[PDB]
Amino acid sequence: NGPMHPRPLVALLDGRDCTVEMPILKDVATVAFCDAQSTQEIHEKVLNEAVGALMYHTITLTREDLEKFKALRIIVRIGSGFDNIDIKSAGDLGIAVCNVPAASVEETADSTLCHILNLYRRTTWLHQALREGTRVQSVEQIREVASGAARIRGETLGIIGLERVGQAVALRAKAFGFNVLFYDPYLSDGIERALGLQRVSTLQDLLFHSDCVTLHCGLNEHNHHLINDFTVKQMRQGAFLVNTARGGLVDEKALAQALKEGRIRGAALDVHESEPFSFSQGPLKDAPNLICTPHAAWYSEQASIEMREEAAREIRRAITGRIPDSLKNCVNKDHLT
């Protein structure tokens, strides 16, 4: 029961476009966007009054940031992952946090397969070479310039985390002749049978046996820097690494090192946990055999529209309905006061 009323304020924290949200929110909320990179860039009014918040992945919200909001009831994340939010302490303050789990599931799995195929077939590097003036003529040169393209069939793809994307990735994999096995601790027993996938129990198990390792794992306390000096050594000689999950899962220091030494034949990263920049600054400087996309595995126009509208509705359900009942996609029911 804080400060003020008429019709409640809902702020887009790390963006400046609400044109998709506007027809859903118009009548029930006062729309304003703070285009803020951090909590400092969000104006005074907003912290003191914001009833609901909409946000993407650009801004991290910590207990410190959360303590500052005075009338905050809900924070809705436009997208799946909410590691950029302290969900524990957010509920400990009474703010329910939600997400959009579904929108870009297949878009992500497609970029993933793209990445896997781009390492195995060298399509991207081969094009980049052609751009950069390389000059392929004889068959000998074809074999040379495309040196170490591989036959996929028989190859073992190890998937880490078979919640959502993990699944779609796997199914697709199958059709390419990939030997598909996975590691996921939080998933219940049985699923691997229903899906006809091999499951291993330990992490080093998958590392040991996969020719290609992809990440599709939520980011939390434990799995931070899951790939590092110790675990990276448990991988195969010249095993490919794909990461379109979160960035904090891979010690870029250890990966950059391992790429140069030749122990990891190539990596494809859509997520480099190291805010916007890289390739010019960061450990991955001149790391050989390393594809990079700018956090775009999720993106397609139609998926963006979709997730924006779902996020918008959650906000509406929040405002007109009741916390935490009305909410369809709440992620900290467990932590609410």
UniProtKB/Swiss-Prot annotation:
Residues 1-50 are annotated as: Interaction with GLIS2 1. Cofactor binding induces a conformational change. Residues 268-337 are annotated as: Interaction with GLIS2 2. It comes from the Eukaryota. Its main location: cytoplasm. GO terms for cellular component: cytoplasm; extrinsic component of presynaptic endocytic zone membrane; GABA-ergic synapse; glutamatergic synapse; neuron projection; nucleus; presynaptic active zone cytoplasmic component; transcription repressor complex. Changing residue 32 to E: Strongly reduces interaction with E1A. One of its GO terms (molecular function) is transcription coactivator activity. Its EC number is 1.1.1.-. The level of phosphorylation appears to be regulated during the cell cycle. NAD(+) binds at residues 80, 160-165, 184, 217-223, 244-246, 270. The modification Phosphoserine is found at residue 280. It is found in: Cytoplasm; Nucleus; Synapse, Synaptosome. Homo- or heterodimer. Heterodimer with CTBP2. Interacts with ELK3 (via its PXDLS motif). Interacts with RBBP8 (via its PXDLS motif); the interaction is disrupted by binding to adenovirus E1A. Interacts with PNN, MECOM and ZFHX1B. Interacts with ZNF366 (via PXDLS motif). Interaction with SATB1 (non-acetylated form); the interaction stabilizes its attachment to DNA and promotes transcription repression. Interacts with PRDM16; the interaction represses white adipose tissue (WAT)-specific genes expression. Interacts with GLIS2, HIPK2, FOXP1, FOXP2, HDAC4, HDAC5, HDAC9, NRIP1 and WIZ. Corepressor targeting diverse transcription regulators such as GLIS2 or BCL6. Has dehydrogenase activity. Involved in controlling the equilibrium between tubular and stacked structures in the Golgi complex. Functions in brown adipose tissue (BAT) differentiation. This is C-terminal-binding protein 1. It comes from Rattus norvegicus (Rat). The gene is Ctbp1.
